[PDB]
Copies of this chain bind each other. A is one copy, B any other.
Amino acid sequence: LHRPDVYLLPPAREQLNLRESATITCLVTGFSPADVFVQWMQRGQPLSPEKYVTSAPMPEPQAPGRYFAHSILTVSEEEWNTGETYTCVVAHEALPNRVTERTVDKSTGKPTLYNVSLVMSDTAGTCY
């Protein structure tokens, strides 16, 4: 009996080079006993069940009592110019708030540049 850890991943960099579609994966692990299902909402509106494909709970490679599941979803490539953040969610009985909404966006991810601009002054005490 442990908290069901969850994660989300963005589409692959080389995937955005054929201009057909894109896939977003929400990984759900743990949740012992295995009681989860994912509903992919966007802007608070649930998507059609035909888009996301959840499969089954599967035991972890080393499974004393733990399990895991994977669920993906298919979108259109040309819609990623705006993101829409395509939120994911999980549900389990071993959760104080029984919801762990997880969402990512084109903006979220690996930074391709780090423009640090530190400054030195003797009047920053107040930090207006």
Query: Contact residues of A with B, CB < 8 Å?
Result: 3, 5, 7-10, 12-15, 18, 21, 23, 25, 27, 29, 41, 44-46, 50-53, 55, 58, 60-62, 68, 70, 72, 74, 89, 91, 96-97, 99, 101-102, 107, 109-126, 128
Residues of B within 8 A of A116 (CB): 114-118
Asked if A12 and B27 make an inter-chain contact with CB atoms under 8 angstroms apart, the answer reads yes
Nearest-neighbour CB distance to chain B for A46, whole angstroms, equals 6
Asked if A111 and B113 make an inter-chain contact with CB atoms under 8 angstroms apart, the answer reads yes
Asked if A29 and B23 make an inter-chain contact with CB atoms under 8 angstroms apart, the answer reads yes
Selected contact of A115 from candidates B5, B110, B117, B120, CB within 8 Å: B117
Selected contact of A44 from candidates B96, B119, B122, CB within 8 Å: B96
Residues of B within 8 A of A121 (CB): 119-126
Residues of B within 8 A of A124 (CB): 119-122, 126
Residues of B within 8 A of A13 (CB): 109
Asked if B118 and A118 make an inter-chain contact with CB atoms under 8 angstroms apart, the answer reads yes
Asked if B55 and A74 make an inter-chain contact with CB atoms under 8 angstroms apart, the answer reads no
Asked if B55 and A70 make an inter-chain contact with CB atoms under 8 angstroms apart, the answer reads yes
